[PDB]
Each structure stands twice: as C-alpha cells, then as structure tokens.
Amino acid sequence: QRKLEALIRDPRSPINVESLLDGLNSLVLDLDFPALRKNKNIDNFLNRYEKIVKKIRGLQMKAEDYDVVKVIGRGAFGEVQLVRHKASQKVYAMKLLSKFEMIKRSDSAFFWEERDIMAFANSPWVVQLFCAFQDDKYLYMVMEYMPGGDLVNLMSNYDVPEKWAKFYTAEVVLALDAIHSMGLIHRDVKPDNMLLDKHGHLKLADFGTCMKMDETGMVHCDTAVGTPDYISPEVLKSQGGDGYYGRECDWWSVGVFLFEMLVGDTPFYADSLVGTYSKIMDHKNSLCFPEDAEISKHAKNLICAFLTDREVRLGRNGVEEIKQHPFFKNDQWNWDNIRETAAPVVPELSSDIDSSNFDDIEDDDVETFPIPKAFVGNQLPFIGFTYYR
C-alpha cells in the first residue's frame, strides 16, 4: 500500500481526504435533479450515499459555523462580511464567491493555486487565508480581518503628507517584493487592496488577480481587471492578445498610488472608461501635476520614474534601486525594520468587531446555475478547493 497513503496524506496533493470529500460531495450535487434520476444507476447511487453525505456537510465547515456581524464589502461575486466563528469566538473577514458567476466564460483551471502558494508562504505583507470551504452556491474564503480599512478610505479622510506617503509607499514596495519572490505578480495593485491592521500597518490582498510567472518571469493571461486607473500600459495592450508582461506592471501601480496620495486624484482620471484607457496609453503626453498642489522634486521624480515605458521604468533591475530613491530618506524607519516602527495612522479600535473604518452597504436575489437536463457537471471545477489551515 506504500506510497498510496502518502499521496492521500500530503495536504498539497489533489487526492487528499478533503479533495476526495469535495469530489464525492460535488458528484452528488450534479446528479440530484429529478431528470437525471430516471437513470437506474444514478438513482440507486444517490439513495445510498444521500444520508451520509448530509451528515458530512454538517460536520465539515459551513456558513452556519460563523456569525455575520456586519457587511463590510461587495463584491460583484458576493459580499465581504465580518464574521465570528462561534466555536472559536474568533473574528474573521469572509469573502463569498458565487459559483456560476465564477465561470468567467473561457478557460479556468485550478483557479486556486495562486492563493494556495500564497497561504503556504505566510508573508506578513499579504492578507492571510485561514480556512476556505464551499457549498452548492458559494465559495467561502476566511481571511484575517483588517480593521484599519483600505487606503481609499484613508485618503478620503486625510490630507496625506509626504512623510506618510513615504511610509505607505515603502510598505507596498516591500509587499510587492514579497509577492514577486513567491513567483507571483499581482496585476491589480490599487488602494482597494491595501489594507491596514490593528496597528496601522499595510498588507496587500489578492482579489483573484495574482498569477504565477513563466520561467522567463512573464505571465500571459487573458483575464482582466475592469477599471484601469491603476493599470499599466503593457497590461492594457495585452487584453486583446495575451500578451506577456513581467513583474514591472506592479511598479507602475505604485506610481499611480503615489500620485493619488499626494495630488488628490489619479493621474489619468477621466469621466469615461474610454478616456482613462486612452489617457493611460498616451501617458508620455498626458501625465502632469496640477499647478497648485506642491510636491517635492524627489516625490515628483519617483512618480515619473514609475510612470514611463516598461523599458526604462524604475525597478526592472530589481527592487534595490527602488529603495535607493532619495524620496525614501527619513528619520523614522529603515527598510530593514519598517513593520515594527510606528504607523502614521493608528486606528482607534474600541472593540474586536469595530468596523467604523468600513463604509456601510445596502442590502441589494442571487442567480445561480440553471437546473440541468442531462449531466453537465457544474461542480467538478471546485473539487480540491476546500482548504483548512
């Protein structure tokens, strides 16, 4: 029996126990429709394993194990709800992901893996996955709660000075170097994904965009982000084609971040989605700083070093030349130790479910798979998704 139990044991293996449970659990859902039960063999199968399957679903991991405290986000695929695992009394942030909606129409995988290789790295710059489970209608992702909110809410609540901008930019740079060292590139760095913890220190979150690189250090996918205020030219060019951009697409985003933090608006803002795309494409000519908004030459120099063609953009020789940039001189922190210095904005958190750093959200009614006639097997793409710390 030698190697068999070992393949089942390895928690990274695709045929460990919780994958076998996912598999059998999915197969049941794809066969329990009163059309398919006309088949002799399908009916007998369900009649035996139906009972014990619901007993499993009871013991496994379920939305009922958690209390919905408040809704802190949405979502387009689901919600971001502040939850308290009743058994552990612990607080988490849970992202619901509608399946069906998760069928972005062409090719998929496996799918997760990006989030897998992040969790198994446990960087303190990346919002951390603890548990991940599913039912018939949703994928569930249980993350560490970030009670300081995102940097959208921060910039809308403060006039960010350059002393703060150094700090938040530096921690983003250290987070991107962390993700890049895992073999991934983010492709969606924006203030929505920059989240602050108990102490006002920043972590990056993956909203499903991170991708593992070539052996050329490239990625070439297809799959989008919708609004482009923070997206580089090489990514926009490639949505039509494929089209191989490197890790330096993320450093463009840092430049956009630093512009918005010091200026008040994004560099290529426009009413229309079109106008922003065309303005980003025309960045050699469209980028400019407002007449008033006073900005140090060092800061203005760094922004422009990030917002150029990816041929000459700052940081495609490695991250070291980002750290050397004069804008990052300060009396308060070293790159060596910044995550244990004092943050500029420490949140005033009064309890462990304080969510005052998250805007309120209305109650919006969900859409799902069509009931099939013949076996279509909608659930097979999620065999292996369930994950336990």
Query: Active-site positions?
Result: 188
Q: Is 88 in the site for a copy of itself (CB under 8 A)?
A: no
State how far the Cα of 76 lies from the Cα of 64, in Å rounded to an integer: 22
**Binding residue per annotation — 338?**
no
Give the helix ranges, DSSP H, for 189-269.
Answer: 233-238, 249-263
What are the Cα distances from residue 367, in Å, to 60, 69, 77, 101, 370?
25, 24, 11, 8, 9
Exactly one of 12, 40, 297, 329 binds a copy of itself (CB under 8 A); that residue is 40
State how far the Cα of 229 lies from the Cα of 274, in Å rounded to an integer: 11
Q: Is 89 in the site for a copy of itself (CB under 8 A)?
A: no
> Which listed range, 5-13, 154-162, 200-208, 332-340, lies at the site for a copy of itself (CB under 8 A)?
5-13
Give the helix ranges, DSSP H, for 226-377.
Answer: 233-238, 249-263, 273-281, 283-286, 297-306, 320-323
Q: Is 12 in the site for a copy of itself (CB under 8 A)?
A: no
Q: Is 117 in the site for a copy of itself (CB under 8 A)?
A: no
**Binding residue per annotation — 76?**
yes
Nearer to a copy of itself, 1 or 272 (CB): 1
Nearer to a copy of itself, 51 or 297 (CB): 51
Nearer to a copy of itself, 100 or 289 (CB): 100
Q: Is 35 in the site for a copy of itself (CB under 8 A)?
A: no
Q: Is 38 in the site for a copy of itself (CB under 8 A)?
A: no
Point out residues after which the chain has a gap (C–N over 2.5 Å): 364
Q: Is 337 in the site for a copy of itself (CB under 8 A)?
A: no
What's the burial of 101, exposed, middle or buried (CB within 10 Å: 0-12/13-18/19+)?
middle
Q: Is 122 in the site for a copy of itself (CB under 8 A)?
A: no
State how far the Cα of 247 lies from the Cα of 315, in Å rounded to an integer: 9
Longest CA–CA span in the chain (Å) reads 77
Q: How far is the CB of 47 from a copy of itself (least distance, A)?
A: 8
**Binding residue per annotation — 315?**
no
> Which listed range, 58-66, 158-166, 261-269, 305-313, lies at the site for a copy of itself (CB under 8 A)?
58-66
Exactly one of 7, 35, 293, 346 binds a copy of itself (CB under 8 A); that residue is 7
DSSP string, 26-70: HHHHTT-STTGGGSHHHHHHHHHHHHHHHHHHHHS--GGGEEEEE
Peptide bond between residue 75 and the one before it cis (omega within 30 degrees of 0): yes
**Binding residue per annotation — 75?**
yes
**Binding residue per annotation — 78?**
yes
- Summarize the chain as % helix, strand, coil (round to 5): 35, 15, 50
Exactly one of 34, 59, 329, 363 binds a copy of itself (CB under 8 A); that residue is 59
**Binding residue per annotation — 74?**
yes
> Which listed range, 6-14, 291-299, 302-310, 356-364, lies at the site for a copy of itself (CB under 8 A)?
6-14
Nearer to a copy of itself, 130 or 335 (CB): 130
Query: Cβ neighbours of residue 387 under 8 Å, at least 6 residues apart?
Result: 18, 112, 116, 119, 129, 131, 132, 133
Backbone angles phi, psi at 129, to 5 degrees: -90, 130
Q: How far is the CB of 7 from a copy of itself (least distance, A)?
A: 7
CB 233 within 8 A of CB 266: no
Site size for a copy of itself (CB under 8 A)? 47
Q: Is 14 in the site for a copy of itself (CB under 8 A)?
A: yes
What's the burial of 304, exposed, middle or buried (CB within 10 Å: 0-12/13-18/19+)?
middle
- For a copy of itself, the binding residues in 363-382 under the rule CB under 8 A are 374-378, 380-381
**Binding residue per annotation — 340?**
no
State how far the Cα of 78 lies from the Cα of 102, in Å rounded to an integer: 10
Nearer to a copy of itself, 52 or 273 (CB): 52
Q: Is 60 in the site for a copy of itself (CB under 8 A)?
A: yes
14: number of Cβ within 10 Å: 13
Q: How far is the CB of 100 from a copy of itself (least distance, A)?
A: 12
**Residues interacting with a copy of itself, by CB under 8 A?**
1-4, 7-8, 13-15, 17, 20-21, 23-24, 27, 31, 36, 39-42, 44-45, 48-49, 52-53, 55-56, 59-61, 103, 107-110, 374-378, 380-381, 383-384, 388
